[PDB]
C-alpha cells in the first residue's frame, strides 16, 4: 500500500514546538511525501517561500536514509486562486508553457513527480482539467526517453458529489494519473450554522439528508464513475475542525455562532492541529458518533470534531477492504511530529496508526 503524506511550507513559521522543518520526517514513515505548495508565475512553475530551494533539499535528503522514498511537489492549494489555474488551463499557449517547464524544475530540485491541487475546478473547466492532465502526462512519458525514471503525476480531487459532477472527468483522468487522492475530509463544509463532523466515515442514522457527505459515499461514487480501486487514495485528516457553540446544547446538530478559537500554535480560526487537540482534551468531555464512527469533544463553549488513533485505524481498515491503493494524510506537520504533546510516546501517532494497519494484511 502507498502512504502519501503532505508536508506544508508555512509550518516552519509556527512559533515554538509547533514549528516544523522537513527535518522532522521519519524517512521510513510514509512512502511518498508531497511538499506543499509551489506557485505558478509567468505561466511557469516556481518557488513560493524565500527558502523553498533550501527545504526542498532538506526534504529530498530523506531519500539518503531511505532509497525507496519518493517525493513530489504540489501546484495550487488554497491560497492559489482556482481562477488563476483556470486561465492557465483553458488557454493552449500558456498550458504548453506551464507543462513544458515542469520536468526541468522537478529534476533540478530532485522531486519524483508533480501533484496537482487545483482547488475545485468548476463546470466550465472539466474539458481543460482533462486537457492539462492528459498533456502533462504525455510530456512526462516523452521526457523519460532521456533515460531517467519517469516522473509521477497525481491530483488532489474533491469528494463532494456536486464537486465531482461539476468539475472532473474521473473516467478520463484516472487513465492518465499515477494516483488520485480523494479529499475525504472537507464534508460539513464552509457554511452550516449547525455542528457536524468534517470527516465522517459512514452515513449515520441521525442523518437522513446529507448522505453524499462521508468517505464511504465519496469512495463508492468514484469507483462507480470509472476510477480503478488501485489508483484511489483516501484522505485521512490529522487535524480537527472546531466550533464556538451558541447554547448549552452540545449534542448532535446543536446551533453555532462561528468557528472555534485559534490554537496556541496553529493560529487560525476553525482549525486545530492534532497536537493541540491532545492538549484540548484534558478537561474536555469526549463523545463519539458510533454511526459515523468518529469522535468529537467539548469544553466550555468549544466543540471540536477530530480524528484519533482509533478512528484512523478504522478508516484504514475500510480502505483495505474496499481495496484502494492506500491512504493520504493531510499534514505530517499537523500530527504530533515531535511526539511530546499526546500522552503516549510515539512520534507521529496518527500517521503511525494508518501505517500499522496498512502494514498488517
Ligand atoms: C505567485 O505568483 C504570482 C505571479 O503569478 C505573484 O503575484 C504577484 O506577482 C508579481 C510579483 O511582484 C506582481 O507583479 C509586480 O511586478 C511588476 C513589475 O513590472 C509591477 O509593475 C507590479 O505593480 C507588481 O508589483 C503582481 O502584483 C502579482 N501578480 C498576481 C496577481 O499574481 C505572487 O507573488 C507569487 N506568490 C508568492 C507568494 O510568491
Of 318, 313, 238, nearest to 271 (Cα)?
A: 238
Say if ligand 1 is within 6 A of residue 48 CB: yes
CA–CA–CA angle 345, 2, 327 (5° rounding): 65
> In 296-320, which positions are buried (b, 16+ CB within 10 angstroms) versus exposed (e)?
bbbeebbbbbbbbbebbbbbbebbe
CB 352 within 8 A of CB 29: yes
> Residue 242 in contact with residue 225, Cβ under 8 Å?
no
How far from the centroid of its chain's Cα atoms is residue 183's Cα? 6
According to DSSP, the β-strands at 271-273 and 232-237 are unpaired
CATH 3.20.20.80 fits 1-238+307-361, yes or no: yes
Ligand 1 atom index nearest CA of 47 = 39
Q: What is the DSSP letter of 18?
A: G
Sorted by where each begins, the domain ranges of the chain are 1-238+307-361, 239-306
Query: Residue whose CA is closest, atom 11 of ligand 1?
Result: 41
Q: Which three cell numbers stand for residue 321?
A: 477492504
C-alpha cell, 337: 511530529
CB distance 185 to ligand 1 below 6 Å: no
Q: Which of 39, 44, 52 has the most ligand 1 atoms within 8 A of CB, as the residue to mutate?
A: 39
The atom of ligand 1 lying closest to the CA of 80 is 1
* Residue 191 among known ligand-binding residues: no
Backbone gaps in the chain, preceding residues (C–N over 2.5 A):
none
Q: What angle do CA 249, 251, 255 make, to 5 degrees?
A: 50
List Cβ neighbours of 341 (8 Å cut-off, separation of 6 or more): 17, 275, 276, 278, 279
Which contacts of 143-151 are long-range, i.e. CB under 8 A and separated by 24 or more positions?
143/103, 148/107, 149/112, 151/102, 151/103, 151/106, 151/107, 151/111, 151/112, 151/113, 151/114
Say which DSSP state 341 is in. S
Distance 42 CA to ligand 1 centre (A): 9
Chain centroid to CA 305 = 17
Residue nearest to atom 28 of ligand 1 (CA): 41
Experimental method reported for this structure: X-ray
DSSP for 29-45?
T-SEEEEEEEEE-SSSE
What is the architecture, at CATH level 2, of domain 239-306?
Answer: Roll (3.10)
DSSP letter, residue 17:
G
Annotated resolution, angstroms: 3.0
The residue contributing the CA closest to ligand 1 atom 32 is 41
User: How close are the terminal C-alpha atoms of the chain, in Å?
Assistant: 10
Cα–Cα distance, 158 to 222 (Å, whole number)? 10
CB 264 within 8 Å of CB 179: no
3-state secondary structure of 166: helix
Angstrom distance (rounded) from CA 312 to CA 316? 6
Contact 35, 358 (CB under 8 A): no
Does the CB atom of residue 140 touch ligand 1 within 6 A? no
Contact 327, 320 (CB under 8 A): no
For ligand 1, whether the C-beta of 41 sits within 6 Å is yes
User: How far, rounded to the nearest angstrom, does the alpha carbon of residue 7 sit from its chain's CA centroid?
Assistant: 10
10 annotated binding-site participant = no
Return the residue whose CA atom lies nearest to atom 39 of ligand 1.
48
Was 186 annotated as part of a binding site? Answer: yes
Amino acid at each position: 500500500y502507498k502512504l502519501i503524506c503532505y508536508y506544508t511550507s508555512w509550518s516552519q513559521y509556527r512559533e515554538g514546538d509547533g514549528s516544523c522543518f522537513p527535518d522532522a520526517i521519519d524517512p521510513f514513515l510514509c512512502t511518498h511525501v508531497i511538499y506543499s505548495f509551489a506557485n505558478i508565475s509567468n505561466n511557469e512553475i516556481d518557488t513560493w517561500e524565500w527558502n523553498d530551494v533550501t527545504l526542498y533539499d532538506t526534504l529530498n535528503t530523506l531519500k539518503n536514509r531511505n532509497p525507496k522514498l519518493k517525493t513530489l511537489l504540489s501546484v495550487g492549494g488554497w491560497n492559489f486562486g482556482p481562477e488563476r489555474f483556470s486561465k492557465i488551463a483553458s488557454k493552449t499557449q500558456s498550458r504548453r508553457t506551464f507543462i513544458k517547464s515542469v520536468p526541468p524544475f522537478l529534476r533540478t530540485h530532485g522531486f519524483d513527480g508533480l501533484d496537482l491541487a487545483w482547488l475545485y475546478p468548476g463546470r466550465r473547466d472539466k474539458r481543460h482539467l482533462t486537457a492539462l492532465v492528459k498533456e502533462m502526462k504525455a510530456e512526462f512519458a516523452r521526457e523519460a526517453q532521456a533515460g531517467t525514471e519517469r516522473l509521477l503525476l497525481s491530483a488532489a480531487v474533491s469528494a463532494g458529489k456536486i464537486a465531482i459532477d461539476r468539475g472532473y472527468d474521473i473516467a478520463q483522468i484516472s487513465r492518465h494519473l499515477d494516483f488520485i487522492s480523494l479529499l475525504t475530509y472537507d464534508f460539513h463544509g464552509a457554511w452550516r450554522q449547525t455542528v457536524g463532523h468534517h470527516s465522517p466515515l459512514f452515513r449515520g442514522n441521525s442523518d437522513a439528508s446529507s448522505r453524499f457527505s462521508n468517505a464511504d459515499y465519496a469512495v463508492s461514487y468514484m469507483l462507480r464513475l470509472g476510477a480503478p480501486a488501485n489508483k484511489l487514495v483516501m484522505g485521512i485528516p490529522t487535524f480537527g475542525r472546531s466550533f464556538t457553540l451558541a447554547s448549552s446544547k452540545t449534542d448532535v446538530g446543536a446551533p453555532i455562532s462561528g468557528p472555534g478559537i485559534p490554537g496556541r500554535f496553529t493560529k487560525e480560526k476553525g482549525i486545530l492541529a492534532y497536537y493541540e487537540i491532545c492538549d484540548f482534551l484534558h478537561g474536555a468531555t469526549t463523545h463519539r458518533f458510533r454511526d459515523q464512527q468518529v469522535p468529537y469533544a467539548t469544553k466550555g463553549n468549544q466543540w471540536v470534531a477530530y480524528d484519533d488513533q482509533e478512528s484512523v485505524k478504522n478508516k484504514a481498515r475500510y480502505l483495505k477492504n474496499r481495496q484502494l491503493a492506500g491512504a493520504m494524510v493531510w499534514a505530517l506537520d499537523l500530527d504530533d511530529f515531535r511526539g511530546t504533546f499526546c500522552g503516549q510516546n510515539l512520534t507521529f501517532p496518527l500517521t503511525s496508526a494508518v501505517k500499522d494497519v496498512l502494514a498488517r494484511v
